Design a protein around this motif. Sequence first.
Motif, PDB file in Angstrom:
ATOM      1  N   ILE A 237       0.539  -1.145   0.027  1.00  0.00           N
ATOM      2  CA  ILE A 237       0.195   0.080   0.025  1.00  0.00           C
ATOM      3  C   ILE A 237       0.876   1.346  -0.059  1.00  0.00           C
ATOM      4  N   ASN A 238       0.722   1.951  -1.076  1.00  0.00           N
ATOM      5  CA  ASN A 238       1.607   3.129  -1.319  1.00  0.00           C
ATOM      6  C   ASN A 238       3.087   2.966  -0.773  1.00  0.00           C
ATOM      7  N   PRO A 239       3.631   2.024  -1.686  1.00  0.00           N
ATOM      8  CA  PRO A 239       4.936   1.534  -1.409  1.00  0.00           C
ATOM      9  C   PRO A 239       6.110   2.596  -1.734  1.00  0.00           C
ATOM     10  N   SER A 240       5.622   3.365  -2.168  1.00  0.00           N
ATOM     11  CA  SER A 240       6.531   4.776  -2.949  1.00  0.00           C
ATOM     12  C   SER A 240       6.666   5.777  -1.813  1.00  0.00           C
TER      13      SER A 240
ATOM     14  N   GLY B 129      10.009   4.042 -11.105  1.00  0.00           N
ATOM     15  CA  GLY B 129       9.400   5.289 -10.950  1.00  0.00           C
ATOM     16  C   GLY B 129       7.810   5.217 -11.002  1.00  0.00           C
ATOM     17  N   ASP B 130       7.529   4.092 -11.550  1.00  0.00           N
ATOM     18  CA  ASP B 130       6.171   3.910 -11.957  1.00  0.00           C
ATOM     19  C   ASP B 130       5.897   2.446 -12.061  1.00  0.00           C
ATOM     20  N   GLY B 316       8.510   1.726  -7.294  1.00  0.00           N
ATOM     21  CA  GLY B 316       9.235   2.170  -5.832  1.00  0.00           C
ATOM     22  C   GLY B 316      10.087   0.935  -5.851  1.00  0.00           C
ATOM     23  N   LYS B 317      10.075  -0.105  -6.488  1.00  0.00           N
ATOM     24  CA  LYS B 317      10.671  -1.343  -6.620  1.00  0.00           C
ATOM     25  C   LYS B 317      11.766  -1.648  -7.537  1.00  0.00           C
ATOM     26  N   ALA B 318      13.095  -1.994  -7.323  1.00  0.00           N
ATOM     27  CA  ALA B 318      14.061  -2.256  -8.371  1.00  0.00           C
ATOM     28  C   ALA B 318      14.028  -3.477  -9.007  1.00  0.00           C
TER      29      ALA B 318
END
Lengths: 394, 394, 394, 394
Positions: A237-240, B129-130, B316-318
């Motif tokens: 949930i909103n990991p960013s 980024g997305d 947000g994940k590599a």
Amino acid sequence: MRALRLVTSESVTEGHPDKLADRISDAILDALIAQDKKARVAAETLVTTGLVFVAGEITTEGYVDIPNLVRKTVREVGYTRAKYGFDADTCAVLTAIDEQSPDIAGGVNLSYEWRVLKSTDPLDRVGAGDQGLMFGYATDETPELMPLPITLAHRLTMRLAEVRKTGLLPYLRPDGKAQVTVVYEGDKPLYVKTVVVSAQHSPEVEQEQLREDLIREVVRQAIPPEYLKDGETEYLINPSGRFILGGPHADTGLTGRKIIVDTYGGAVPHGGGAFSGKDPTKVDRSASYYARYMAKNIVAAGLARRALVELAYAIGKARPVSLRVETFGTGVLPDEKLTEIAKKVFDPRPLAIIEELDLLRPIYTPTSAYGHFGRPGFPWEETDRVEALRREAG
Amino acid sequence: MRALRLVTSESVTEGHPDKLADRISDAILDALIAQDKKARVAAETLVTTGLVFVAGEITTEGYVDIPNLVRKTVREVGYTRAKYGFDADTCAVLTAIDEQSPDIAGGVNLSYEWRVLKSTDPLDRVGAGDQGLMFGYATDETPELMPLPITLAHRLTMRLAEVRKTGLLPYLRPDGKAQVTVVYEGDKPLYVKTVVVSAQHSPEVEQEQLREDLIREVVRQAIPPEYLKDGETEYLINPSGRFILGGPHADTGLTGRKIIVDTYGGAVPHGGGAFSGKDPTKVDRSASYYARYMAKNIVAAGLARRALVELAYAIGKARPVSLRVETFGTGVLPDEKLTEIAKKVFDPRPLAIIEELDLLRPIYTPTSAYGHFGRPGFPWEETDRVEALRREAG
Amino acid sequence: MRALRLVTSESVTEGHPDKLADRISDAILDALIAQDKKARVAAETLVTTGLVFVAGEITTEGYVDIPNLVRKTVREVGYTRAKYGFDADTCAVLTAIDEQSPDIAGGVNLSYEWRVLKSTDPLDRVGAGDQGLMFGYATDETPELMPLPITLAHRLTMRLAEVRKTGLLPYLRPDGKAQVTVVYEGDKPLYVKTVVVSAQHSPEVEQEQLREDLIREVVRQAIPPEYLKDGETEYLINPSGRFILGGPHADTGLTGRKIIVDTYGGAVPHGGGAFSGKDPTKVDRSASYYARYMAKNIVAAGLARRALVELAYAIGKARPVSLRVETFGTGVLPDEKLTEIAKKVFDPRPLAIIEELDLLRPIYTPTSAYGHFGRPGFPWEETDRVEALRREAG
Amino acid sequence: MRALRLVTSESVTEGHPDKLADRISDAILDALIAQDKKARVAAETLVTTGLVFVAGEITTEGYVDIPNLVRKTVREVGYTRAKYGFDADTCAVLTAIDEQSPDIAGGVNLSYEWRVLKSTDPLDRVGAGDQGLMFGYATDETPELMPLPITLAHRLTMRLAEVRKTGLLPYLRPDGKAQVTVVYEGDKPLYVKTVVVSAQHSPEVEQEQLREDLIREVVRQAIPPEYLKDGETEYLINPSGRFILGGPHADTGLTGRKIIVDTYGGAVPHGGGAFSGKDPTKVDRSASYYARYMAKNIVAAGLARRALVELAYAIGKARPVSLRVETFGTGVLPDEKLTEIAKKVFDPRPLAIIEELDLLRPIYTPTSAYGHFGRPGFPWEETDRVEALRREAG
């Protein structure tokens, strides 16, 4: 056959800048068709900081007050206060529309089969305005006859919007994204490995009421119970980090930049055409709708478990250069025979499509978000050609 | 195996309003990256009557003169006189760009695996980024390891551009489209059922001189003679009537509205992302490039005849939420094994991709038309991991 | 008095970008009020390379298609090919107008003498929309009852336009300027010391043919032979070098940036208001017209040789805070008596002005160039109050 | 000479949309001159709902970030909140500037006296870019040598700004207007008959606290007690109803639409030119400044009580076509003798002006509101030619 693959699809809420541009384009189309049902529209919307820019071509005998419609449209998806990052009362509305009444310009021009071939057939009368490639898909994974991942993603974003609109979670803001990764054992989906929900919200809420509330009120409602497994399904949930500012201020939004979200979410090929802002004489929209219609009728009639219908149009031509039906080993009959069955049951000519689905009505704004397919109340989602298909097949 | 299916794909020339928008966006990107290679770009271009409208976001320590760059760019593609419908010298160039000095904003934020998981791994540092979904494809139907229909279409539009530019057919104007319908015996392409070319030209020329010149100077040269078969292949030249006015005056052009033309022409699924105007830190572009890189290497290494590589990213994940390799019965090894081999051979994290292909160079304007794939001299078209794959295979 | 004075005034042609903006603004106003006589318009036009940008406020129950109106208007002043620097067909037309019906918004709200004073007088009901200061002028040096320098300048640019339009000098292009410096017998003109004409032209023609053509076909026609003196009047034709490129491409044009050209050319003070784009309820326009009307009537009735009328308005107030009449020693009667006579003959309240001059008609486009005053066929140029003024005088 | 007349003049605050456009234009000019002192600037600003639109031409090669500069400029003037209808953070900033480096284009071209006459004189080298007419005025009614009504009007709007900015009256918003009607006994101003202040404010305050606060803190501070007479002086505060809604959202603002407020407030004629957004090579600005300089010096030297200096320029010419000095019966010497005295003391050629006043400095933003004349610290307000004039006179 029992092998395990991960399949991912995603959706955005109506408040996403791309989807907001789509909704603006289609709101314009709807208003024009409401006043003129033969109105010809190609409306493109650019959305960015402080600005909505509408450009494109219109041929109609009605008039729509575009800036007010745009502001109305921005208000519907929820951008009504500056804090949200965009505001309908205070943003600029720019217009660069070539608007012609059909006395000026002309009527839709003659097809190749009328002009070069000399056909008297009235359904041959309208040709494709542009070259085009279209894909329609259906599969019995879900009741809506849609691939499951895009279905779940759409349900997530749709519900994310509705919990905000009903006031249940009033700290939510319009912008949002949802992603679903599903585990497939061959063709059968088993469970959801990962759910990601990114929701725009006010800073009043902290991440743990945000996470608990979105998981309980959005994810578990939107995703059927069988596919969610505690300890194995991962919820992000909103990991960013936090998502206070969203929409047009954050990013530039354009019409037709969510065509995969609009359609099948990556399950099948796509032809590249965008839907929104286009009246039914644009085959990019109507032929894709008709393709979904054909595929859904074919699967619902029991001729297949999965069906992909491909249409292609040559510019200026009413009749398709290719029509193909694909069942990935799921067809009751050979695919070629299914293809010819389809050719006799269906009429993929533009005017025929428009008349068969009754496309000249202001029905397109609700398509602007949450997908054009898999939803009840749309003409191309009606499986009323089932028994014709069954009789033709035997 | 014996049945006959029709496969259709299409391309547009560089003078197409959509593709012109793409080229403007990428020219801006190239110019910015030339002065600053840590530059962050999301440039969107709207193109319409008398107007180029550039919007979006730019982070740089460089400065690029956008209007001068836009006019130069419009000039290269050939819009130099008003009669063509668009003119680099007299059109309006509008700018609404939020431009970032890295002093303001920030460096790219920390990835989920850094911030939430606690990874010290530097290749984990940059996250997507997305949210994204990416497809990469290769097949040995052609030498470029691309599907044949999109290849032929691209060659048609590319050459249609070059005969205009060399003065060979000096009446040609920049806008143009090409469509190809190919007859497939299952997996094997046989011949072209239909070729359609719509070319913009001065009205001084008429259609039978146009037909002769385009068939001899464009179609028979751009398409190898084996696929052209006497008496069965139909040649359509400007079936839509004539094409005097083209580009922005006829149609509105937007960045990222040719994503299928940019990629595989409908042979395989698409994730929805647009390439142009985006710097390599956007996984929509770089991961699609990398997926092409993997697929092309896998096929070139002889591990498959056809290979589809799917990548998906959570925001947000590599690390990709899904990575998949699919060979449609063409693999030397089982697909899971090929997948594991791919994971050992390739590193699909964003920073890793940027570094492995050295994407931070002004190489992107030539991608703006005629396809991002199937053309030599692009980093993601290099098959230099063939021998690593062969070693991992055994 | 026997001493010699230099008095300079200037004009521009209809093709000047500022004047083009004024004309676009007034054309919009004309089209709107033609459909609705109480439509409230404050339309501002920005004109620049490749672009017409219309902004401002609009209040109506009519519809005007702004882009076609703009293009038609641009065609009328002569910008029809790219070669001229601006072209009606290929330029961009942008709209950012707040357009409202009084559906929301309102009719003008009640004047101060209605709301705060309790006046039942219906002519008191409409107050001045803004604070204002207005000047009207007339003098018997010329038949039109105008100051000579601005008159000669207007005649010059008007004639340059006319020789262009009729084909007499077919190399001429729309943009043009004229300046006149006159030698004065304290108060009455003797001769023109200097004439400057700058005319846009094709590069095919050269400066001494340009010079002869302009002196014989423009200057000597437009300026009476009485004021032209051999050996002392200097003719400057394009003293700036060639004038190939003109209009929006060379310079940026805005509504209301030629207000002195619009009025008296510097003979008398000005209050700062612009005319074009404004409906008659804006006192800046209607009260200035009315001031000219009074002054011209006063001079035509023989009460003075020169008359200057001052009006001043407080915001929200129908009745002018001051009305004053100045005859610079030229009055038959004391200036105060002329003032009280004027107060009895004329009614300078806004609604009163509108009804007395019948201003709610599409009569404003021809005002956008060559001066709002000194020309026949305008309501405020009618000398129909002569006999009333004469009876009040005796 | 002895009669009683009402003389009215007015001003607007810095928050007035027209004046905000002026300030943005001049802020652009100042940044450019700061990086490049020979920068050639003609910047025009349109200001409206959600939008700042900057257009025009610039020849420099320093670089200024226009959007950042625009937002800073909008912020200083007080538009920091959405409720005001306009906000520096959320508005769109559009640019259509014909940017150039003097490598392309050219250096300023040769004046007429250099190119056609063959002058080696370096001060003759730069000619007028356009035809122009300029008026400069000075009178000993006030210490600043300005007409009293515009002086009081400016002081009112300035103070209305400061009581807002400093927090004294925290309910104030940026938009505002002030008007003054002064009683003149012939040549001598006696007292103020009427002051009207229209101030933008929040709806929490109502009209009687508004009236007492503005009369006590704005009117009485800004107007010297000598001109205020209790029982005869009338104070009108927001006589037009409430003024909650203001700025760009209420009205569209353009550069150079307040030129009388900029100058002498209707006391004298005007030439039509606008000041803001223009570098010193534009005679519209620099020659008006220089004319004010001449007039003020003539009045300060005791050569006249009131002096009006008129300058006029032919396009492409360094030397004025006319120079005139008029003292309305106030001159120590006849007006002619005063004129040639002025010709030998002053040099109105463009380059000479630029050097004499040291205009190539970032000093122009403060001129954008409250008048260009009558304020200390401006080069054209310096009376350093007094004794030269007195000696030429004797």
